């Protein structure tokens, strides 16, 4: 496989930006030089979210007031505007507001044996960008990953069916995952592997 070996400063960088996340908020869904974006005013702060890949067709043009955000800046630089990609979702229905599930979580460094780790998703559409980016913080803040050489793994999220989402820890996630969402109510195990 001819794949770019990515840095591990850059992953750790990457996987360290301050993350802004809101729910139930309005975002303005339009077509821009045939691309998909949706903006939202948090804070009196400006984003340009890329509806690349699914979340494309998820959204109706013009005012979507029912929508969660998980918001990453893309690049280094001085544009007050944030540009992120995907992390948009549909917010909670009012039987879910106060909804907490805890999936198994466990956390393999090496040859060691999994750790189990307490995890809490609170909600019934999540995107891949935010289990991505929450999960690699958590192996990066407790086991060292992009530290010390170790870049190497995986993330498997298995669901009540059996379906399962992997991520491989040697890149960021694909764009075009950043956009898909799943159902959280459905997430059975997680497991983060690094080597
Ligand atoms: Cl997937
Ligand atoms: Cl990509
Ligand atoms: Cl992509």
Not at 54 to 59: A, G, H, L, P
Not at 109 to 131: A, N, T, V
């Amino acid at each position: 496989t001819e794949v770019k070996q990515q840095s591990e400063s850059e992953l750790k960088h990457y996987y360290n930006k301050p993350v802004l996340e809101r729910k139930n908020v309005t975002g303005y869904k339009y077509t821009e030089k045939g691309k998909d974006y949706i903006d939202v005013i948090v804070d009196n702060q400006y984003s340009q979210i890329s509806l690349v890949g699914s979340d494309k067709d998820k959204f109706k043009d013009g005012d979507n007031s029912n929508i969660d955000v998980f918001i990453l800046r893309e690049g280094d630089s001085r544009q007050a505007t944030n540009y992120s990609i995907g992390g948009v979702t549909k917010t909670n229905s009012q039987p879910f507001i106060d909804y907490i599930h805890t999936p198994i979580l466990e956390i393999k460094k090496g040859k060691e044996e999994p750790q189990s780790s307490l995890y809490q998703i609170y909600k019934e559409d999540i995107s891949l960008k935010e289990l991505d980016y929450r999960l690699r913080e958590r192996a990066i803040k407790q086991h060292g990953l992009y530290s010390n050489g170790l870049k190497q793994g995986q993330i498997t999220i298995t669901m009540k069916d059996g379906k399962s989402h992997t991520i491989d820890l040697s890149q960021k996630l694909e764009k075009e995952r950043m956009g898909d969402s799943i159902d959280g109510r459905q997430i059975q195990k997680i497991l983060v592997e690094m080597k």
